[PDB]
Amino acid sequence: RFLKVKNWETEVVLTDTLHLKSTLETGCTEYICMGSIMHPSVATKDQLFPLAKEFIDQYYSSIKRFGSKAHMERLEEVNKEIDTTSTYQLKDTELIYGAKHAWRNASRCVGRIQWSKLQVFDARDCTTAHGMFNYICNHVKYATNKGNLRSAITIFPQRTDGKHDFRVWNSQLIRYAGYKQPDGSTLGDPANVQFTEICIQQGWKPPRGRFDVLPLLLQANGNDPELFQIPPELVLEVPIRHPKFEWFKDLGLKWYGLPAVSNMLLEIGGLEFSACPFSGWYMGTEIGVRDYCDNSRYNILEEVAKKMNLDMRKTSSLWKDQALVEINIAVLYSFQSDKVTIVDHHSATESFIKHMENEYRCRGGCPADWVWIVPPMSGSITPVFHQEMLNYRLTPSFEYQPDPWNTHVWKLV
Amino acid sequence: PRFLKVKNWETEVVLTDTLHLKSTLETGCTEYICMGSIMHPSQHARRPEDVATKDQLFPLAKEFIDQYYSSIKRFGSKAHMERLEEVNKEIDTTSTYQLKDTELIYGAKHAWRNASRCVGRIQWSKLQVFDARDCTTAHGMFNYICNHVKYATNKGNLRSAITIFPQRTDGKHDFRVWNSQLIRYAGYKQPDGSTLGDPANVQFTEICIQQGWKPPRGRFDVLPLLLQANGNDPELFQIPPELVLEVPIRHPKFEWFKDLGLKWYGLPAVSNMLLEIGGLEFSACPFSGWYMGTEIGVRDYCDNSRYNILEEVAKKMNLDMRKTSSLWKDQALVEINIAVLYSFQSDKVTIVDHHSATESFIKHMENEYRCRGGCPADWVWIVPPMSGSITPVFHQEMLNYRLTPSFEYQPDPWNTHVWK
Ligand code: HEM
Ligand code: HEM
Ligand SMILES: Cc1cc(N)nc(COc2cc(CCN3CC(F)C3)cc(F)c2F)c1
Ligand SMILES: Cc1cc(N)nc(COc2cc(CCN3CC(F)C3)cc(F)c2F)c1
Ligand SMILES: C[C@H](O)[C@H](O)[C@H]1CNc2nc(N)[nH]c(=O)c2N1
Ligand SMILES: C[C@H](O)[C@H](O)[C@H]1CNc2nc(N)[nH]c(=O)c2N1
Ligand SMILES: [Zn+2]
Question: Where in the cell is it found (chain A)?
Answer without folding.
Answer: Cell membrane, Sarcolemma; Cell projection, Dendritic spine
